[PDB]
Scaffold this active site. Structure first.
Site, PDB file in Angstrom:
ATOM      1  N   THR A 134       0.827  -1.200   0.000  1.00  0.00           N
ATOM      2  CA  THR A 134       0.000   0.000   0.000  1.00  0.00           C
ATOM      3  C   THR A 134       0.865   1.256   0.000  1.00  0.00           C
ATOM      4  O   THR A 134       0.602   2.193  -0.753  1.00  0.00           O
ATOM      5  CB  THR A 134      -0.940   0.024   1.220  1.00  0.00           C
ATOM      6  OG1 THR A 134      -1.657  -1.218   1.290  1.00  0.00           O
ATOM      7  CG2 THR A 134      -1.913   1.179   1.123  1.00  0.00           C
ATOM      8  N   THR A 135       1.915   1.242   0.826  1.00  0.00           N
ATOM      9  CA  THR A 135       2.823   2.391   0.969  1.00  0.00           C
ATOM     10  C   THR A 135       3.632   2.612  -0.314  1.00  0.00           C
ATOM     11  O   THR A 135       4.123   3.718  -0.574  1.00  0.00           O
ATOM     12  CB  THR A 135       3.757   2.187   2.177  1.00  0.00           C
ATOM     13  OG1 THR A 135       2.952   1.938   3.340  1.00  0.00           O
ATOM     14  CG2 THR A 135       4.631   3.423   2.426  1.00  0.00           C
ATOM     15  N   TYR A 195     -13.170  -3.365  -1.933  1.00  0.00           N
ATOM     16  CA  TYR A 195     -14.282  -2.830  -2.724  1.00  0.00           C
ATOM     17  C   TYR A 195     -15.430  -3.830  -2.937  1.00  0.00           C
ATOM     18  O   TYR A 195     -16.593  -3.472  -2.717  1.00  0.00           O
ATOM     19  CB  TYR A 195     -13.779  -2.217  -4.052  1.00  0.00           C
ATOM     20  CG  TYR A 195     -14.851  -1.537  -4.879  1.00  0.00           C
ATOM     21  CD1 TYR A 195     -15.611  -0.502  -4.354  1.00  0.00           C
ATOM     22  CD2 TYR A 195     -15.095  -1.931  -6.200  1.00  0.00           C
ATOM     23  CE1 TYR A 195     -16.597   0.122  -5.106  1.00  0.00           C
ATOM     24  CE2 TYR A 195     -16.091  -1.304  -6.968  1.00  0.00           C
ATOM     25  CZ  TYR A 195     -16.834  -0.280  -6.407  1.00  0.00           C
ATOM     26  OH  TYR A 195     -17.831   0.354  -7.131  1.00  0.00           O
ATOM     27  N   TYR A 207      -3.050 -10.178   4.525  1.00  0.00           N
ATOM     28  CA  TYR A 207      -3.005  -8.782   4.936  1.00  0.00           C
ATOM     29  C   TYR A 207      -4.436  -8.269   5.138  1.00  0.00           C
ATOM     30  O   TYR A 207      -5.232  -8.229   4.204  1.00  0.00           O
ATOM     31  CB  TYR A 207      -2.174  -8.007   3.899  1.00  0.00           C
ATOM     32  CG  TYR A 207      -2.148  -6.501   3.992  1.00  0.00           C
ATOM     33  CD1 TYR A 207      -2.382  -5.821   5.192  1.00  0.00           C
ATOM     34  CD2 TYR A 207      -1.819  -5.755   2.872  1.00  0.00           C
ATOM     35  CE1 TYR A 207      -2.344  -4.428   5.230  1.00  0.00           C
ATOM     36  CE2 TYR A 207      -1.769  -4.401   2.900  1.00  0.00           C
ATOM     37  CZ  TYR A 207      -2.025  -3.726   4.067  1.00  0.00           C
ATOM     38  OH  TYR A 207      -1.960  -2.348   4.041  1.00  0.00           O
ATOM     39  N   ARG A 238      -9.355   0.223   4.853  1.00  0.00           N
ATOM     40  CA  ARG A 238      -9.092   0.487   3.437  1.00  0.00           C
ATOM     41  C   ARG A 238      -9.923  -0.389   2.489  1.00  0.00           C
ATOM     42  O   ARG A 238     -10.216   0.034   1.382  1.00  0.00           O
ATOM     43  CB  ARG A 238      -7.617   0.253   3.107  1.00  0.00           C
ATOM     44  CG  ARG A 238      -6.641   1.271   3.680  1.00  0.00           C
ATOM     45  CD  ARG A 238      -5.217   0.966   3.255  1.00  0.00           C
ATOM     46  NE  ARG A 238      -4.278   1.971   3.754  1.00  0.00           N
ATOM     47  CZ  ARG A 238      -4.035   3.143   3.175  1.00  0.00           C
ATOM     48  NH1 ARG A 238      -4.650   3.492   2.055  1.00  0.00           N
ATOM     49  NH2 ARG A 238      -3.166   3.978   3.726  1.00  0.00           N
ATOM     50  N   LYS A 247      -0.278  -9.873   8.179  1.00  0.00           N
ATOM     51  CA  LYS A 247      -0.135  -8.457   8.509  1.00  0.00           C
ATOM     52  C   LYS A 247      -1.477  -7.981   8.991  1.00  0.00           C
ATOM     53  CB  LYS A 247       0.324  -7.671   7.288  1.00  0.00           C
ATOM     54  CG  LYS A 247       0.467  -6.174   7.542  1.00  0.00           C
ATOM     55  CD  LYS A 247       0.996  -5.494   6.287  1.00  0.00           C
ATOM     56  CE  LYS A 247       0.967  -3.981   6.408  1.00  0.00           C
ATOM     57  NZ  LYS A 247       1.381  -3.378   5.162  1.00  0.00           N
ATOM     58  N   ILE A 250       5.232  -4.734   9.842  1.00  0.00           N
ATOM     59  CA  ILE A 250       5.412  -4.222   8.483  1.00  0.00           C
ATOM     60  C   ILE A 250       5.067  -2.733   8.551  1.00  0.00           C
ATOM     61  O   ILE A 250       3.904  -2.354   8.694  1.00  0.00           O
ATOM     62  CB  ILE A 250       4.581  -5.007   7.447  1.00  0.00           C
ATOM     63  CG1 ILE A 250       5.072  -6.462   7.403  1.00  0.00           C
ATOM     64  CG2 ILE A 250       4.707  -4.375   6.047  1.00  0.00           C
ATOM     65  CD1 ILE A 250       4.267  -7.395   6.505  1.00  0.00           C
TER      66      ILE A 250
END
Lengths: 292, 292
Positions: free
Chosen positions: B44-45, B107, B133, B138, B161, B203
């Site tokens: 994501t980062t 989504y 994860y 999000r 994660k 993480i």
């Protein structure tokens, strides 16, 4: 002006998960016969997530071809990358669609300014009407009324599908935009209330299987006959709720199959088949609507 | 196993938003020098959302190249379509990565059974370790411990994660899985607590700019020296917070640039530039950490 009962049409699939043209034709014929105002092609209910960009384009073009001018088609064109949103939108330029439904970027959680720049860039790369789409429960993002007001000043941004179920948003948006800006419900369960508060219609899951009743309800609402609209809404309320007993569009695809509207209720992973318990829940709701 | 301080590394970009190899090299050298345990590439980062498939593959391969065997690399391979996730995973087979970080579909909001089938299918198309994860804020989707338990019996599925910040999840998961299954924090602000509750590492976004401190903190935590680990966490606490007030990775990229670790802080839309308040609070947070 976009109004009334707009179906977020399922993307019917064969057993291999490919778009099933005969079933899509049947659905499109059904919406023409039922008085559905427009079709949203490859929205959330159309499994936008699991169709690649060419399959997506194919389904929209197939929907236009089968529609054959009888009912307007709005393309789902949302993406969480602005470059991809622009590209999808450009694909449908001069296709025959009357508009685009474009969701707030999901997963990456842009700021209000990010949302503004995203939708502005999209609108600047198209001549097609743009319907913004806010559904924070899916996206992690909440497009606030203030930002909608800013975007409504941009050429081509002409409406919003507001899927929060938060009825306070209707007038919060209405007071920040011109009288021609369209407010459409994205939450079947609260859509009639949304219209009574000033909404102009609904982009609907329920309309997939109760197209006639949804169109009549939206007509009555438009005419200010809310007593009569409420009778229909109560008839359909179990459907409004139970089409989400398992993740959309799992229940509504089963319902389409059960009503003989599509050949199979197949979906693409990570969507999975309806459970036996879900089947019975949905069946009861269909019976309450007088559809089974 | 995967333990300690693992950086969710930024994808450094030039002014045009293209991946910047010189800056990526500096960052990787920095992580080797700082004692970072591994690099998560295009998480994501790393702006996974706005890199296309080829760019995503390119960033991972470049990161491997520049790493040159000095630090393990884990590829971000998540997708909201199972087919896409499998394809992404297959791209990196025999690349040199030591594992994959794969997020719950976003989504489309699959069921727990959908999540099970999604991750099971992915695991079955690879020989690489899979780190699940979960980040509901999000995705709109919450992978529950029970489902993690089921998945941990699948070969190749060896960690999670966990980004909820919910410390109760640590042992709800640990109690259902093997002693070798790793729990890694995906929430910098609660990461030390997460380790104190039985987690194995983090993480981290903060490790992008405080790699040495994050590595030391995780080491002290693993050794059971939490008093000493807290001293470091208190130093970093403003960074843990201010790297996320504006949308990640906007703040952390600005911070990287301010420290001279990357040439530009450029992102891709719908990410937009840091605001004045952001610059000031992140600068203050960096000073609070003794980094500026």
């Amino acid at each position: 002006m976009f109004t009334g009962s707009i179906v977020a049409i399922v993307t019917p699939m064969d057993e291999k998960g490919n778009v099933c043209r005969a079933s899509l034709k049947k659905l499109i014929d059904y919406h023409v016969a039922s008085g559905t105002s427009a079709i949203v092609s490859v929205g959330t209910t159309g499994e936008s997530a699991t169709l690649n960009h060419d399959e997506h384009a194919d389904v929209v073009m197939m929907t236009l071809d089968l529609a054959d001018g009888r009912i307007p088609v709005i393309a789902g064109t949302g993406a969480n990358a602005t470059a991809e949103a622009i590209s999808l939108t450009q694909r449908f330029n001069d296709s025959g669609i009357v508009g685009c439904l474009t969701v707030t970027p999901y997963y990456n959680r842009p700021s209000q300014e990010g949302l503004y720049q995203h939708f502005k860039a999209i609108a600047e790369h198209t001549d097609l009407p743009q319907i913004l789409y806010n559904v924070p429960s899916r996206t992690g993002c909440d497009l606030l009324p203030e930002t909608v007001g800013r975007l409504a000043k941009v050429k081509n941004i002409i409406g919003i599908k507001e899927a929060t179920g938060n009825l306070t948003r209707v007038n919060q948006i209405k007071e920040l935009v011109s009288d021609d800006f369209v407010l459409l419900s994205g939450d079947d369960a609260s859509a009639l209330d949304f219209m009574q508060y000033g909404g102009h219609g609904v982009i609907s899951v329920t309309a997939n299987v109760a197209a006639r009743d949804m169109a009549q309800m939206c007509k009555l609402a438009a005419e200010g006959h809310f007593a009569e609209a409420r009778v229909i809404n109560e008839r359909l309320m179990p459907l409004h709720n139970k089409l989400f007993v398992e993740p959309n569009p799992i229940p509504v695809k089963w319902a389409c199959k059960e009503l003989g509207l599509v050949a199979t209720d197949t979906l693409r992973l990570p969507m999975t088949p309806i459970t036996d318990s879900g089947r019975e829940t949905v069946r009861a709701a269909l019976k309450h609507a007088g559809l089974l």
